[PDB]
Symmetry: C5
Subunit: 103 residues, 5 copies
Amino acid sequence: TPQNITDLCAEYHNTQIHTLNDKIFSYTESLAGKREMAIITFKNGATFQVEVPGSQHIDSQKKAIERMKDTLRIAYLTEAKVEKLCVWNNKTPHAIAAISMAN
Amino acid sequence: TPQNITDLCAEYHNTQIHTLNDKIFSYTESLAGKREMAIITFKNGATFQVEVPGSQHIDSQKKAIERMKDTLRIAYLTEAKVEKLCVWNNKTPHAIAAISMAN
Amino acid sequence: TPQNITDLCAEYHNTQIHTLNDKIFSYTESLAGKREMAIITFKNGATFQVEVPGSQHIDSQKKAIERMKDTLRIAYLTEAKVEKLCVWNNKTPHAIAAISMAN
Amino acid sequence: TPQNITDLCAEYHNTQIHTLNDKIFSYTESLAGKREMAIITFKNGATFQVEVPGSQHIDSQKKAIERMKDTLRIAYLTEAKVEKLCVWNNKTPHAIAAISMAN
Amino acid sequence: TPQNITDLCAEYHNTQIHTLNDKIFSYTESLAGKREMAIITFKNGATFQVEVPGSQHIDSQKKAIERMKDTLRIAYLTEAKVEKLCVWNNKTPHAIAAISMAN
Ligand SMILES: CC(=O)N[C@H]1[C@H](O[C@@H]2[C@H](O[C@]3(C(=O)O)C[C@H](O)[C@@H](NC(C)=O)[C@H]([C@H](O)[C@H](O)CO)O3)[C@@H](O)[C@H](O[C@H]3[C@H](O)[C@@H](O)[C@@H](O)O[C@@H]3CO)O[C@@H]2CO)O[C@H](CO)[C@H](O)[C@@H]1O[C@@H]1O[C@H](CO)[C@H](O)[C@H](O)[C@H]1O[C@@H]1O[C@@H](C)[C@@H](O)[C@@H](O)[C@@H]1O
Ligand SMILES: CC(=O)N[C@H]1[C@H](O[C@@H]2[C@H](O[C@]3(C(=O)O)C[C@H](O)[C@@H](NC(C)=O)[C@H]([C@H](O)[C@H](O)CO)O3)[C@@H](O)[C@H](O[C@H]3[C@H](O)[C@@H](O)[C@H](O)O[C@@H]3CO)O[C@@H]2CO)O[C@H](CO)[C@H](O)[C@@H]1O[C@@H]1O[C@H](CO)[C@H](O)[C@H](O)[C@H]1O[C@@H]1O[C@@H](C)[C@@H](O)[C@@H](O)[C@@H]1O
Ligand SMILES: CC(=O)N[C@H]1[C@H](O[C@@H]2[C@H](O[C@]3(C(=O)O)C[C@H](O)[C@@H](NC(C)=O)[C@H]([C@H](O)[C@H](O)CO)O3)[C@@H](O)[C@H](O[C@H]3[C@H](O)[C@@H](O)[C@H](O)O[C@@H]3CO)O[C@@H]2CO)O[C@H](CO)[C@H](O)[C@@H]1O[C@@H]1O[C@H](CO)[C@H](O)[C@H](O)[C@H]1O[C@@H]1O[C@@H](C)[C@@H](O)[C@@H](O)[C@@H]1O
Ligand SMILES: CC(=O)N[C@H]1[C@H](O[C@@H]2[C@H](O[C@]3(C(=O)O)C[C@H](O)[C@@H](NC(C)=O)[C@H]([C@H](O)[C@H](O)CO)O3)[C@@H](O)[C@H](O[C@H]3[C@H](O)[C@@H](O)[C@H](O)O[C@@H]3CO)O[C@@H]2CO)O[C@H](CO)[C@H](O)[C@@H]1O[C@@H]1O[C@H](CO)[C@H](O)[C@H](O)[C@H]1O[C@@H]1O[C@@H](C)[C@@H](O)[C@@H](O)[C@@H]1O
Ligand SMILES: CC(=O)N[C@H]1[C@H](O[C@@H]2[C@H](O[C@]3(C(=O)O)C[C@H](O)[C@@H](NC(C)=O)[C@H]([C@H](O)[C@H](O)CO)O3)[C@@H](O)[C@H](O[C@H]3[C@H](O)[C@@H](O)[C@H](O)O[C@@H]3CO)O[C@@H]2CO)O[C@H](CO)[C@H](O)[C@@H]1O[C@@H]1O[C@H](CO)[C@H](O)[C@H](O)[C@H]1O[C@@H]1O[C@@H](C)[C@@H](O)[C@@H](O)[C@@H]1O
Ligand SMILES: [Ca+2]
Ligand SMILES: [Ca+2]
Ligand SMILES: [Ca+2]
Ligand SMILES: [Ca+2]
Ligand SMILES: [Ca+2]
C-alpha cells in the first residue's frame, strides 16, 4: 500500500506526477451523453480530465470516479491549493488518477 | 475527447454556447411529479433548465443530471461566477448540457 | 416546460405560491419510522413539510424528495433568502412542491 | 402529521425531548464493523448516538439514518445551534430520532 | 454500545488511539484501480489511510467507508481540529476505524 501520492503513481504504467502547488483556475462539468466528465485547468495552462466511465474502469472505480468529481468541485469553490496530481499521460487531457491537497 | 466546453459543445447538434461571466441570480428546484427539474436565471433575464430525466437520456446521463443540479445549487450559494453554458437550443427554456466556472 | 416557479405551480391542482422573501428560521429533520420527513418554519410563523415518501409519489419523485431536504438544510445553514415556495395547501403542514431562491 | 419536533416526539413510545440551545461540542464517527455509528456530545456532558442500522429499523429509515449523520457532521462544522433533540431514552447513549436547529 | 471513541477502540483487536489535537495537514485520494483509498497526514508526520474496500470488510461497512472519506475531506477543507483517531496498527499506513473532532 503506498504512503503518498508519488508512491501510488509509481504502481501504474503510463502515469506521472504534476506538482501544481496552486488552486484550480477553472472547473467544467458535462451531462451530455458519451461526455459525462469533468475538466479542470490551472493558471500555468495545464488541463486535466476525470474520464467518462468506460470499459477501462473496474467496478471498484465507479464510486471513486464520482468522488473525484465531487472533490474537484469543492476544491475549486473553496480555492483549495492542489499540491500534486497523479495522471495517466496516455489520454488528452491527461486523466486524473489521484489528487493531494496541502497548504 | 474535448479539452474545453466550447469544443465539447461542437460535438453535438442543436447546441450553442452562452457566455454569461456572471453569478446565478435565481435557483429554482421542483419535486413535483413530471417536473423533477431545476431552473436558473441570470440578472440579464436569461433562463435555463436542467431537463426532467426522460427517454432522450441514456443510462450514463442519469447520475450526471443529478450532479449538474448539485453543481448549480452550490454555484448559486457560493455566488460562483459562471463563464459559459453549453445548451440544447431546441428546448424552452434552453437545456443545460455543460457548465464552465472561472473567476 | 415552465420558466419560473409560479408557472410551474399552475401546472398542478391544489397548489399555492407563498412569497416569503426571508431566510429559513428553523430546520427540523426526523429518521423516526413513518415520519422520515423535514419541517421548516419562517419567522412569521409559516410552517412547511417535505412529505414522507408514499403512494402519492411516482418513482421519479423519490430522488427529488431527497434533493429537496438537502436543499432546505444547506439553505438554512447559509441563511439563504427563500423567494417563493410552491406548496400543496390541502396537506398540514403545507407540503413543499418547489422552492425558488433569489437575493 | 406533526408541525414541530415536540409533537413528533409525542407520536412515539419511549422518547424524550432534550432542549440544548447550543452547538455540538464533539462529533465522532466510526466505520468499524458492527459499530457503524456516530456519537455527538454537548459541553454540558450530554452524549447522543445515531444507532447502528439494524432490525429495529424499517426500510424507509435507511436513507434517513444516513441523512441524520450528514446533518450532525455539517451542524458540527458550521457551529450551528441545536435547539432540541428527540431521542429514544432507553438506549445508551440516548438514540437520536429527530433534530431541530434554530438561532 | 460505546459512549466515546476510546471505549469504541477497545472493542477491537489490533487497534490503538492516536491523540492528534491538530488539523489535517494533507488530504490525498485516489481513483486508480485497486487503490481506491484516501491518505491523510498531520504536520508532525503521522500518516493514516482509509483502506481500499475489500474482503476484510462486511457489507455494513461499505457506506461507512465512503462516509469516512467524505468526513476527512470536509474536515481538511474546514481546518477542523481532529482530537483522536482510532486506527488498526496491522496495516501501513495505519488504517482509520474512527475519528473524533472537538475544539
Ligand atoms: C441530435 C439528436 O437527435 N440527438 C439525439 C441522439 O441522436 C443520435 C445522433 O445525434 C448525436 C446528437 O447530436 O445528439 C450526434 C453527436 O455527434 C453525438 N455526440 C457524441 C459526442 O457522442 C450525440 C450522442 O451520441 C448522444 O447525444 C448521446 O445520447 O448524438 C443523431 O445524429 C442520430 O440521428 C440518426 C437518426 O436518429 C436516424 O433516424 C437517421 O436519420 O440517422 C441519423 C444519423 O445517425 O441519432 C443518434 C441516436 O442513436 O440520440 C440521443 C440518445 O442517444 C438522444 O435521442 C438525442 O436527443 C437529444 O437529447 C438531448 C439530451 O440528451 C436533448 O434532450 C435534445 O433536445 C435531444 O434532441 C432532440 O430529441 C431527441 C430525442 C431526438 O428527437 C432529436 O432529433 C432531437 O433533436
Ligand atoms: C497499462 C494498462 O493498460 N492498464 C490497464 C490494465 O492493465 C492491467 C495491467 O496494468 C496495470 C496498470 O499499470 O494499470 C499494472 C499495475 O501494476 C496495476 N496497479 C495496481 C496497483 O494494481 C494496474 C491495476 O491493477 C489496474 O489498472 C486495475 O484495473 O494494472 C497490465 O500490466 C496488463 O497488461 C497485459 C496486457 O493486457 C496483455 O495484452 C499483454 O500481453 O501483457 C500485459 C502484461 O500482463 O493488463 C492488466 C489487465 O487488467 O487493465 C485495466 C482493466 O483491468 C485498464 O484497462 C487499464 O487501462 C488504463 O485504465 C486507466 C484507468 O484506470 C486509464 O484510463 C488508462 O488510460 C488505461 O490505459 C489505456 O487504455 C486501456 C484500455 C489499454 O488499452 C491500455 O493499454 C492503455 O494504455
Ligand atoms: C389532483 C390529483 O389527483 N393529484 C394526483 C395525481 O393526479 C393526476 C392528475 O393530477 C395532476 C395534479 O394536479 O397533481 C394533474 C396535472 O396536470 C399533472 N401535472 C403535470 C405537470 O403533469 C400532475 C402530475 O401528472 C402528477 O401529479 C405526477 O404524478 O397530476 C389528476 O388531475 C388526474 O385526475 C383524473 C382522475 O383521476 C380521473 O378519474 C378523471 O376521470 O380524470 C382526471 C384527469 O384525467 O389523475 C392523475 C393521476 O391518476 O396523481 C399523482 C400520481 O401520478 C398523485 O396521486 C397526485 O396526488 C397528489 O400528490 C402530491 C405529491 O405529488 C401531493 O401528495 C398531493 O397532496 C396529492 O393530492 C392529494 O392526495 C392524492 C393522493 C389524491 O387524493 C388527491 O386528489 C389529493 O389532492
Ligand atoms: C415502542 C416499540 O416497540 N417500538 C418498535 C415498533 O413498534 C411498533 C409500535 O411502536 C411505535 C413506536 O413508538 O415506536 C408506536 C407509534 O405510534 C408509531 N408511530 C408512528 C408515527 O407510526 C411507531 C412507528 O410506527 C414505528 O416506530 C415505525 O417502525 O411505532 C408499538 O406500539 C406496537 O405495539 C403493539 C404491540 O407490539 C402489541 O404487542 C400490542 O398488543 O399492541 C401494540 C399496539 O399497536 O408495535 C409496533 C410494531 O409492531 O416497531 C418498530 C419496527 O416496526 C421498532 O421495532 C420499534 O422499536 C424502536 O425502534 C427505534 C428505531 O426506529 C429505536 O431503536 C427504539 O429503541 C426501539 O425500541 C426498542 O426496541 C423495540 C424492539 C421494543 O422492544 C421497544 O420496547 C424498545 O424500546
Ligand atoms: C481481529 C480480526 O481478525 N479481525 C477480523 C474479524 O475477525 C472477527 C473477530 O475480530 C473482532 C475484531 O477485533 O475485529 C473481535 C471484536 O470483538 C469484534 N467487535 C465487535 C464490536 O463486534 C470485531 C467485529 O465483529 C468485526 O471486526 C466486524 O467485522 O471482530 C476475531 O476475533 C474472530 O477470530 C476468530 C478466528 O477467526 C477463529 O478462527 C477462531 O476460532 O476464533 C477467533 C476468536 O473468535 O473472527 C471474527 C470473524 O469471524 O473479522 C472481520 C470480518 O468480519 C475482518 O476480517 C477483521 O479483520 C480486520 O478488519 C479491519 C477492517 O474492518 C482491518 O482491515 C484490520 O486490519 C483487519 O484485521 C486483519 O485482517 C483480517 C482479514 C484477518 O487476517 C485478521 O487476522 C487481521 O488481523
Ligand atoms: Ca480568491
Ligand atoms: Ca454578494
Ligand atoms: Ca445571520
Ligand atoms: Ca467559534
Ligand atoms: Ca488557516
